[PDB]
């Protein structure tokens with residue numbers, strides 16, 4: 488029996504020589520590229536968004552990362568966000584304090600310079616695609632849509648990225 492798998496994708500792992508290269512390898516800037524979810528409503532929050540730039544930094548205490556983002560809305564306005572992720576020994580999963588109920592799984596990406604998140608939470612799930620480049624190859628994005636659709640997240644949103652990034656700070 489055959490023809491019943493989704494394209495190859497793997498969860499990031501802290502295993503193997505170079506395992507403790509997580510998280511330092513992923514620090515720095517990222518751009519939001521696309522989302523996919525079981526329903527359009529799980530992506531609705533992104534509909535007035537033109538682009539988002541993020542900066543991930545080492546935290547102010549041991550197992551913690553500082554995330555900063557500025558959202559360019561389609562109306563030109565810039566909205567800054569900030570939060571803290573918590574890391575756990577031997578895992579690449581992210582947890583944020585609101586709430587203990589949600590987790591974020593990290594997956595490797597066919598996009599060079601890309602990463603995919605799988606966000607799980609109360610009554611919802613969505614897949615989120617980021618890249619170091621604000622303009623990764625269209626093929627990367629097609630592959631993310633094809634993968635997420637195979638995983639039954641068929642509602643898809645591509646961020647337009649027509650306008651300049653808002654300023655962030657590193």
Ligand SMILES: CCCCCCCCCCCCCC(=O)O
Pocket residue numbers: 510513514517541543552593602606615617
């Ligand atoms: C150390 C892991 C680095 C992963 C890089 C992705 C950086 C951007 C994360 C954005 C989080 C999504 C926030 C949201 O759901 O609104």
